[PDB]
Nucleic acid binder design. Structure first.
Ligand SMILES: Nc1ncnc2c1ncn2[C@@H]1O[C@H](CSCC[C@H](N)C(=O)O)[C@@H](O)[C@H]1O
Ligand SMILES: [Zn+2]
Ligand SMILES: [Zn+2]
Lengths: 276, 629, 255, 255, 252, 255
RNA sequence: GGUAAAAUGGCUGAGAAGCAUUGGACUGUAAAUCUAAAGACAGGGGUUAGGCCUCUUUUUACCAGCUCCGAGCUCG
């Protein structure tokens, strides 16, 4: 199309536009109708090229650089040890559910961010001393989330020690032992219960539409809870919704006998001054 | 130069709203003809007042400066350092007169740019003021017309865009047609190629438009010139939320909640016209009123349908109409305080005249407003706070118009009010526009129980009031709200007694005076939570009003003057008995409806379930914060 | 050689117990399948041919095993080999502090009765059956082969009852071998690892795949044909007695 | 040191349990004697002082062990050590061809449930009590010590049920230690071998005298005080877990 | 099976290795005898047929084993099985208080060099030879079988050096199997008891034969060869010690 | 009690041997450190007081061990306990197909010449010294304690020479215990797991934390004071002989 | 319902950059590495020369307006 002409002319002006471009992202560019969307998309491409080029120079700068008990094969041993722990957790661990029913309310950017947060959350859960048993409920096959997950994990997807299913959490656990964590719940989480199942909505929701998780929970008459962020720290600025990795790390700290003043260490410091 | 500039019609000239524009720009904002109720309309449609630098008034008349005080106190609470007015030179005297009932309004700064003052230019627009004097210091024959010229914007090479000018013309009557036609300054822009005026806003009665001279005057501006006409011929709903609420409540009880009522382009609400980007009749936000959607939304409520079904399967004069049941600021659903009393089919009494009261009355009665104004016998003003008396001049002018239309003699109205109100109306009559020739005012102190006849004229006036309203006796007492704050009580020959408290606190003189009242109307500004604030602000809480009513032993109790904190409904404490009721805008209450009123509580709870739940949640959060403090 | 031998295989209607029956019948031996009546033992017996007879019996019951042995003696005339492949398992931790759960005594007792008690019952009755056999020219009267998973040496979490039963079998292997030495009966034990039997399929698929991948060589689940091959090797070899052979793949099971 | 510790000793009214109780009470600890009502444990509890109490219970029944643990918690408010020195023993060959005798299933069942099932019952019920203790500086919550004679490794003729029970105890030690590792409870096993308990004294005097000569060094029957010393050493050492220790004096049993 | 399969058998001139060679060649395999030049294994290699070749070598010497493996590669082209059946034995008490005699360090070291060091020396080279084989469809490249007597568990009086070497082999089995697992080589160990080797063959031998529970006789190298063949055939045996004993547990 | 005992500790200038010497001297015994001259054991002997004497000797050569024993007899007059806590560790694969690398024979030989041959040399020379002692009232003349490793049971990739040497000690601990039984000398073996010796604490922090997490309970590296405590318990107990004790924490080595 | 300020979806920034994350490597003890993936400062709009201007959402503060002149509780 004619978009390449304005691309080159803005590159001559250097108005925060990518140095080069590929065909597929170019078609995505003409699939942007607002000049603001095209400007934001071009800036995203521009910052991608800059960071990719900037990090390359670090390789060049690095290029300027008996009796033993064990061979230096530590990475394999850590991986195998985490695998054994995960295999045991898949049988005797406490279930934790990620609800993938929010695939409709997320745009492409929020979908990619959700996948990244899910990757980080699973990685943090694997390394723990007492991991959960992570469930991926309402994960429709060949869906957008499923396709992205199998793209990022590649062949590891078939070997991850977690249960992925197309069913719902209500179809796997008794309705009494299910607690749907959400920021809009009226009930305030007091203590971590080891006999309950906690559901975390795999949601990003940058274009804030609060109450989605609460509506989904109340539709099935499920119990709801909210973190006592307020009771333990001075909330200054920022929405009380937390990322998936922060939520799983808070739950892991609580699960391991930690107190609230220690579990809330993973809340970003830019949101609260300090504890009470 | 700014990148976008467009106009917007806040009010379309309808008899109940007046006319007003709203010039929006990236650098400045302007307003024209701030009439009564303009603040409420602009707040409802989310029109920001943060950077309202200038307000242009095209004529020194209450239809153009009615809501000026409300806008001034709002901009102040907004934090604007200075606001500049433009129009007739009489504004200075008007500003002096406003301070009589208000304070000195020290915070905000007021400036006046009369027509004789040098031209004013801004970062986005140059404004010229054209003084026009009708054929044949108070001046009743001056009208100011505005010609606004935009700044030339250099092109992006893109050719530059020359400034496009628009003209606002006010022609209140036929007497102004020739001065407009013979004006030389208009011929400078009209008969030329200089920036052919993009759009001309005409605010003149339709009888003026059909005149041949005026028709030729508009045609001489060129073929490309548009013409917008706000001429009381508009058919558009201005208060959408009020219509929604009234239609929804009408589904419960129809009687208690009655239903409301040369090329040229007739103005509509929220109609726009861009000038800087391009020149088009945008028309993207035009309000659309459809009762079917409103009743569908009401019926789909979780509990409304069963509640109204249960109420319905269960199954005269005087009648009270609550025109306005809100305290300080006009809001989306509740206007400022007012109460119409219909003693007889031929006589009526207005219990309080807030700002824009006539607008609510016109909306309530529709084409019957002229007949209603004929029956208006007296108006009672209780304490000189703003938004309790500012709507009086509109009522007086509309009463004169209705009497002229209906063919009745102009007999002066009877006003019972504190003597301090005399100074405000006296200054307005002397400096700005003749009013006093319409009222015969009676001081409120002269009607006290222990009062004495100050003058024989006062005794004659009060006797005339008793004859006209057919009342047996009229009494007033000093309630404990502010300096010179009065209640009232009316007793008819039939024997029923009505008592109006007014802004007050729990008082003993009111209880003593209003003993054995048939119906009591009491202030209910706050709830039990903020009794300390109520004492500090000299107001009564809900339980305080209920206790006052019970002690006085009234047959029924009604509450009004709800605070801005309250959005739609007040709380319904278990103390709510069969005698305690609640008030909403535009409901009609008769003496036979007292048993019905308690039965309406479940349907009203259902209709506002979400709002009351949100209010309860907010109160609980506030209580938790207070405890944790 | 195993030609002409008669074998009694407990649990020989599925898994490890069926592979040995298939191999022995194919080689030319006669087999008797000893399994619960609910299992489709009769279908496998019909499939294997005229040298296979299904005997519905319960190992935990003395009368049932006696009736099965009587049927085997009536049909074939002698008993030369006995293979104990019947065995159940349970997955339950001894005590779960966080969940406040305790291992039930009923589960432990049932696992102990099926795995350990039933094996001893079959051993002590089949030994009496072999005692009447005329001695082979090498002095051997019969062979008894047991099964005791590698959990006897390296238990996993939630594998207390299974490890206890298998460890009991392993510990009692040698005393029984010394007991039957005068009457010329050899007692041998096999310690299979992860062999992909219906017992192991109770675990989730991903756990099974990970466990298979962790075998040093070959990195796969065990094949019951390999178990049958080892069983035949034990029968043919006359000098294997009172020893536990781990058919594992060199896998050591982590906690 | 073991001062202030509270210990529950099953079978602590004679033999190795009584010796362990004597040594532990002597060092300043508190002991609870868990034995049968007719074992005469009340006399021993009275003799050992007010720091030792007797709780009549049967280890094979859940209710009796629960009542005994409740009594111990009421008296001392804490349980820190659980030592299992209980168990019957029988002696009969699996099959006696020359006499036509077959091992009875009742004797095997009785020895199995008293020795193996009772030990697991006590362990699972005690772990609930130890789980309520606050972890110490090292994170330890309690120590569980079991007994499993050397018959688990090298059994003799007639020790079929005994070897099965002891081998089951040995095999289940590692999975149980892995189960309670997150809790903070250490599990250990001891192989007493040949000791001067009344069980070994029930044999003919000549047989016992000959047996004491078969120990390489020291050439005498084991002293129960030595077993008590080993138990105390296991309690004191914080790094001993999931291991079987043979306190046999380098003896290896012959056919 | 073992048809067309090449095996390298250490100490094949006589003993358990000779019987293993006889059985393997009988079944259709190819054997390479690796023993001392004076052991007289050339006559046995000639007797067995054209599928047996005598390669004189000393297991303690790297050069001898390398030349023997080169000869095996030249003759047959590949190596698939390695059976380490060589070893010496010595009876001597650690200390005799009555006589004042002390076990000599040279005697102890000589046994370790042949039994333990020789086995590892053969293993580390035959594994390199086996690494060149194309993987079998089951993934297997070769099988290594070691011999370590039951002295590694219950040694007798005077068997200090012998038990040390055999226990070393038993302990070495598992880590070597883990080392060669990615390559695809199975390492297995056999623990023979009382066998009719030339070392063991009147009163003492008769009593020892009676001591075995069942069968009450000395072992048979034919049975040892049968067990070796079974280990070769079975694909799931790896990193384990098998005790071909007869249920005999030695006494002090 | 160990008051008055004289102990010879090989490799006692650092690691487990130093901790054993510190504990034994603290309880009132006397120790003779036996380690290479360049290990700086003279400073440790000076620190421990006049009750401890450094003997510069190499366990591989017979002459230095004899000289050290003569020095110990001259200084104190007798040898009652011998603790072998000296050894080198080497990690190297048997064969690396990708790199084309082979385990060199020199690395294998020098591990045996220290861990296995040196231990036996010290044992045989000390047993002569202990044979001159008058027998104790219990018939004992001395105690010899070796130090194997868990690598002798679960070797990892690369620990082929280490496991061969440590496996030899586990294999030979029983025949030696029978050899010295008439004299009255007890031989015992300890197999520590992951201990915080200086050779192992030099590893980076990340791998040290991983190794600490590997141990089930307590989830930390072993403390040499615990090894010294176990050595003292073995010395005091008269019925421990010819057995290997795993001081591990229930850690089974990962492959 | 209003008024004002702010908003980093892994965390801190700076206004570039660090600490992090995912897949792969059988590492000879700097793997303290190599390689592939993901890098969007609330969300929409516009324009724009950045940067502004606007709409929406969320977080945190805040929400009546009695004027006179002399008699000095009433008088205009
Ligand atoms: N403050 C908080 N308290 C409890 N759960 C929370 C939380 N913040 C996030 N979560 C959980 O983690 C998820 C992160 S996404 C949050 C957005 C969601 N639309 C909502 O506002 O409800 C949530 O869906 C919820 O499951
Ligand atoms: Zn008011
Ligand atoms: Zn008021």
């Amino acid at each position: 199309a004619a978009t390449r002409e304005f691309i080159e002319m803005w590159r001559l002006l250097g108005r925060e536009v990518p140095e080069h471009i590929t065909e597929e992202e170019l078609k995505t560019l003409m699939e942007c109708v607002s000049n603001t969307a095209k400007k934001k998309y071009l800036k995203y491409l521009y910052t991608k090229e800059k960071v990719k080029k900037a990090r390359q120079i670090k390789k060049e700068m690095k290029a300027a650089a008996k009796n033993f008990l064990f061979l230096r094969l530590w990475d394999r041993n850590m991986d195998i040890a985490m695998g054994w722990k995960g295999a045991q957790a898949m049988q005797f661990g406490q279930p934790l559910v990620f609800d993938m029913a929010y695939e409709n309310y997320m745009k492409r950017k929020e979908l990619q961010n959700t996948v990244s947060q899910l990757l980080e959350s699973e990685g943090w859960n694997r390394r723990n001393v007492d991991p959960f048993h992570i469930y991926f409920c309402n994960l429709k096959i060949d869906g957008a989330l499923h396709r992205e997950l199998v793209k990022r994990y590649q062949e590891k997807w078939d070997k991850l020690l977690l249960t992925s299913t197309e069913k719902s959490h209500v179809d796997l656990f008794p309705k009494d032992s299910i607690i749907y964590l959400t920021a809009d719940s009226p009930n305030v989480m007091t203590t971590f219960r080891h006999d309950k199942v906690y559901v975390i909505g795999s949601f990003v929701d940058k274009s804030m539409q609060p109450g989605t998780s609460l509506a989904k929970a109340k539709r099935l008459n499920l119990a709801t809870e909210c973190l006592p962020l307020d009771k333990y720290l001075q909330w200054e600025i920022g929405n009380k919704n937390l990322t998936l990795d922060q939520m799983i790390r808070i739950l892991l700290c609580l699960k391991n006998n930690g107190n609230w003043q220690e579990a809330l260490q993973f809340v970003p410091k830019r949101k609260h001054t300090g504890f009470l | 130069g700014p990148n976008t500039v467009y106009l917007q019609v806040v009010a379309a000239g309808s008899r109940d709203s007046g006319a007003a524009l709203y010039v929006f720009s990236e650098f400045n904002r302007y307003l024209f003809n701030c009439g009564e109720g303009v603040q409420r309309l602009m707040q409802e449609h989310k029109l920001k007042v943060a950077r309202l630098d200038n307000i242009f008034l095209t004529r020194m008349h209450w239809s153009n400066v009615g809501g000026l005080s409300g806008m001034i106190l709002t901009l102040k609470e907004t934090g604007l350092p200075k606001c500049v007015l433009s129009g007739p030179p009489q504004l200075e005297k008007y500003l002096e007169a406003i301070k009589i009932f208000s304070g000195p309004l020290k915070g905000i700064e007021l400036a006046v740019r009369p027509h004789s003052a040098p031209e004013y230019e801004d970062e986005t627009m140059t404004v010229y003021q054209i003084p026009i004097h009708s054929e044949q210091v108070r001046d009743s024959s001056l009208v100011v017309a505005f010609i606004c010229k935009l700044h030339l914007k250099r092109g992006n090479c893109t050719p530059p865009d020359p400034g496009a000018a628009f003209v606002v013309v006010e022609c209140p009557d036929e007497s102004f047609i020739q001065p407009i036609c013979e004006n030389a300054t208009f011929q400078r822009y009209q008969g030329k190629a200089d920036a052919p005026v993009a759009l001309v806003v005409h605010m003149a009665p339709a009888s003026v438009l059909v005149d041949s001279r005026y028709q030729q005057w508009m045609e001489r501006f060129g073929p490309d010139t548009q013409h917008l006409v706000l001429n009381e011929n508009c058919a558009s709903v201005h208060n959408l939320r009020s219509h929604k609420i009234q239609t929804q409540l009408n589904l419960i009880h129809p009687d208690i909640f009655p239903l409301l009522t040369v090329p040229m382009v007739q103005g509509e609400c929220l109609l726009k016209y861009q000038l800087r980007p391009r020149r088009e009749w945008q028309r993207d936000a035009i309000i659309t009123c459809n009762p079917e959607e409103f009743i569908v939304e009401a019926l789909q409520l979780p509990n409304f349908q069963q509640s109204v079904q249960e109420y319905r399967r269960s199954a005269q004069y005087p009648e009270i109409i609550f025109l306005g049941t809100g305290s300080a600021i006009p809001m989306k659903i509740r206007n400022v305080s007012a109460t119409l009393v219909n003693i007889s089919p031929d006589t009526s009494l207005l219990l309080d005249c807030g700002e824009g009261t006539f607008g609510q009355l016109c909306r309530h009665y529709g084409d019957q407003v002229d007949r209603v104004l004929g029956t208006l016998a007296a108006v009672f003003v209780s304490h000189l706070h703003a938004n309790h008396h500012t709507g009086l001049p509109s009522i007086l002018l509309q009463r004169e118009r209705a009497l002229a239309s209906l063919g009745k003699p102009l007999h002066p109205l009877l006003v019972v009010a504190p003597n301090q109100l005399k100074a405000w109306l006296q200054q307005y009559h002397n400096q700005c526009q003749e009013v006093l020739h319409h009222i015969s005012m009676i001081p409120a102190k002269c009607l006290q129980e222990g009062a004495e006849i100050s003058s024989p004229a006062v005794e004659r006036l009060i006797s005339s009031l008793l004859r006209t309203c057919d009342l047996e006796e009229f009494q007033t007492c000093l309630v404990r709200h502010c300096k010179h704050a009065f209640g009232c009580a009316l007793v008819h020959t039939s024997g029923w007694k009505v008592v109006y408290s007014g802004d007050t606190m729990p008082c003993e003189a009111l209880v003593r005076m209003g003993k054995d009242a048939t119906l009591l109307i009491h202030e209910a500004t706050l709830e039990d939570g903020l009794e300390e604030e109520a004492v500090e602000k000299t107001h009564s809480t809900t339980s305080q009003a209920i206790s006052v009513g019970m002690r006085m032993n009234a047959e029924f109790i009604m509450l009004n003057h709800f605070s801005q904190r309250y959005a739609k409904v007040p709380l319904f404490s278990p103390n709510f008995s069969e005698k305690v009721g609640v008030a909403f805008d535009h409901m009609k209450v008769c003496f036979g409806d007292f048993p019905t009123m308690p039965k309406l509580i479940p349907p009203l709870k259902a209709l506002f379930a979400g709002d009351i739940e949100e209010m309860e949640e907010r109160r609980e959060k506030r209580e938790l914060r207070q405890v944790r403090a | 050689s195993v030609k002409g031998l008669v074998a009694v295989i407990t649990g020989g209607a599925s898994g490890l117990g069926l592979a040995t029956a298939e191999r022995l019948v194919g080689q030319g031996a006669s087999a008797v399948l000893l399994d619960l009546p609910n299992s489709g033992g009769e279908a496998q017996a019909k499939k294997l041919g005229n040298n296979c007879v299904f005997a519905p019996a319960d190992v935990t019951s003395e009368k049932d095993v006696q009736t099965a042995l009587a049927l085997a003696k009536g049909k074939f005339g002698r008993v030369d080999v006995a293979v104990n492949c019947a065995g159940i398992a349970v997955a339950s931790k001894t005590y779960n502090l966080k969940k406040g759960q305790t291992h039930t005594l009923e589960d432990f007792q049932r696992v102990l009765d099926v795995n350990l008690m039933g094996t001893f019952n079959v051993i002590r009755l089949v030994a009496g059956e072999m005692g009447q056999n005329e001695p082979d020219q090498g002095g051997q009267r019969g062979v008894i082969i047991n099964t005791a998973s590698v959990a006897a040496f390296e238990g996993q979490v939630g594998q207390a009852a299974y490890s206890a039963s298998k460890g009991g079998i392993v510990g009692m292997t040698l005393p029984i071998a010394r007991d039957l030495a005068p009457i010329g009966i050899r007692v041998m034990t096999i310690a299979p690892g992860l062999f992909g039997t219906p017992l192991l399929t109770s675990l989730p698929e991903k756990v099974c795949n990970f466990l298979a991948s962790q075998v040093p060589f070959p990195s796969r689940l065990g094949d019951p044909a390999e178990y049958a091959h080892l069983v035949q090797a034990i029968i043919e070899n006359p000098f294997l007695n009172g020893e536990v052979i781990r058919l594992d793949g060199a896998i050591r099971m982590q906690p």
